[PDB]
Amino acid sequence: KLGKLQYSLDYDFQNNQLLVGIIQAAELPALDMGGTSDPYVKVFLLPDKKKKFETKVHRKTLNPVFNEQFTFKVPYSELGGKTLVMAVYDFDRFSKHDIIGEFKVPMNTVDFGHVTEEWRDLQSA
């Protein structure tokens, strides 16, 4: 229904940073004339809605490849109370951007001793 996102997670102890890798999306819904969308991904760690990143916009595709990694300065021991949000939006030059769908990861469930890379279905906000 809302597409899928492939991402990965890691933690860098040398800089005390969470690494969020945004790989690609697939089967995104079309939101623009011509049957396509202009997707990008907004990435942030709740409850800090202020520190925020966006991938580049990939215009007129429903299957964008991003290959962008973002870093969040957060102490390892405090990660547990955070929730990572990866939200795919349709870019618009002129107006407020419409959300397509999102995936959330409660950080207390992440095992940094094993692989984290995966495809996940986007959900409505």
- Member of 3, 7, 38, 43 binding Pb ion (CB under 5 A): 38
Q: Considering only 66-74, 77-85, 89-97, 107-115, which stretch makes contact with Pb ion by CB under 5 A?
A: 89-97
Q: Which stretch binds Pb ion (CB under 5 A): 13-21, 22-30, 50-58, 82-90?
A: 82-90
DSSP string, 69-93: EEEEE--GGGGGG-EEEEEEEE--S
Question: Which residue's CB is nearer to Pb ion, number 58 or number 82?
Answer: 58
Cross-strand bridge partners of residue 54: 42
SS3 56: coil
Using an 8 Å Cβ cutoff, are 74 and 18 in contact?
A: yes
Two structure tokens written together for 32: 């623009």
Among 11, 23, 32, 36, binds Pb ion (CB under 5 A): 32
90 binding Pb ion? (CB under 5 A) = yes
Report the nearest approach of Pb ion to the CB of residue 80 (Å): 37
8 A C-beta contact, residue 26 and residue 52: no
Name the residues that contact Pb ion, by CB under 5 A: 32, 38, 90
